[model samples]
Target chain A: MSDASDMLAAALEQMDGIIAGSGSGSSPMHLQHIREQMAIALKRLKELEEQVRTIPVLQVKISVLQEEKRQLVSQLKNQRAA
Target chain B: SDASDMLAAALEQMDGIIAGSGSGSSPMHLQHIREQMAIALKRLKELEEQVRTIPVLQVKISVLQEEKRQLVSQLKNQRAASQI
Candidate 1:
């Protein structure tokens, strides 16, 4: 959908691949590929974190969104009770 | 991240020496040193990304814990106010 959504989905998929690959038979090539991908993914994450840190508004928005989500879930439970 | 950056900078410094060396096979030792340094730099860069993730993940966990604390405090306050 959006850039953030795409990035998040890709990251999750990559992570799933990593987990699955780990369980596969320990071929040297497979291990090397996994390590390389992991290193790249980690580097990308650091870059993303650095970019996010540079945007104060986005950082604040993320915190607010987190709190809002928690409040909404709690309110939904309360509503179910009533 | 710091280590990677340092290694990258070191490689950059070594570049001058690597370039200054004549096209002759005379300074073979220096050439070997440069090659080793280059490989070391590559590995550092490769590991840097993976290593930095640990702290970033820790920060997220810390934030979650803080949120939990805030929620608990809010609930306690609400309960106390209701008693009055």
Candidate 2:
């Protein structure tokens, strides 16, 4: 039922739990660290999403290159015969 | 907070992107680059922790399942996630 985003959201929920747990800590600095970690986690996931965004395109690129290889092969064969 | 909002917006976009990945675009190569143990230990540890937040046992059980499902498809499943 869940997809990538759903899975990711579920992960965030766990993160939220940790943050909430940290929120009660006496040190404001410690609380601030959790907040910073939250931002870093999101950034990492976002970069992950972007890097993955490239994969779908890459799938196409590899396919195109395969065909290109075949075309080159045939052209070489033709040149050899001619 | 502004950061939460930023995360929310990203989650929205991520959901859309991940939704499309149902076709099986797991980005194994990207995972491969990651598997190089090249990324910092801190982030890897954190991400794996996130992965553990769910049924850690469930993930453990599924590793073999997933491996078999894809291992057989190494040839059969080429361009599986993004093919016309």
Candidate 3:
């Protein structure tokens, strides 16, 4: 039942874990570099929410399109069936 | 997600639109409705393509999750070797 939002939250949690655990087995500069990449990836993941917001917009457009198609096609069908 | 359902239904509706959108009307009126239908269909495609990107975003996150698990495991291994 996990929606995209739930999956996204899980991904962020994994990213946080990676950031916290990244300090060992590397030079200080290398560790810093890894942290930077993790930060960049985190930002990308966050932007996914913005993309998700478009679903409502999509629904509205689809509904409108459905109505437009229905009316026009109805007229066309009635005329042709005559 | 209901995306597939929504898309499939819209496509089915589009077929009806195409089939019935001919005969009886003035030619100009018929042309106008068909053109408008084209516009609506284009927008639908754009929306569908836009929605497609979300899955890609999800996949990238899954890849990162894999990376996180592998790194954590390696970290544990290093710690155990150090203790030996």
Candidate closest to the true structure, highest lDDT: 1
Query: Candidate 2 chain B — worst ten consecutive residues by lDDT sum?
Result: B29-38
Q: Identify the runs in model 3 with alpha carbons over 4 angstroms from their true place.
A: A1-23, B1-84
Q: DockQ of each model against the real complex? A: 0.04, 0.03, 0.01
Sorted by DockQ (best first), the order is 1, 2, 3
Per-residue alpha-carbon lDDT of candidate 2 for residues A1-82, written as tens digits (9 for 90 to 100): 2133333344444434434554233243532443344445555555544444454554565555556555555544444444
Using DockQ as the measure, name the better of candidate 2 and candidate 3.
2
Worst 10 residues of 1 chain B by lDDT: B23-32
Best by DockQ: 1
Indicate the docking level reached by candidate 3. Answer: incorrect
What ordering of candidates by lDDT runs from best to worst?
A: 1, 3, 2
The digit string of per-residue lDDT tens for model 1 on B1-84 reads 343353333334334333554422223433433344344334444544445555665576577667667766666556565555
- State in Å the error of residue A25, model 1: 39
Q: How many clashes in each candidate?
A: 0, 0, 0
Cα lDDT of model 1 by residue, A1-82, tens digit: 1132233334334434444554333244643443344344335444554644444554565587578658855854554444
Residue A42 alpha-carbon offset, candidate 1, angstroms: 16
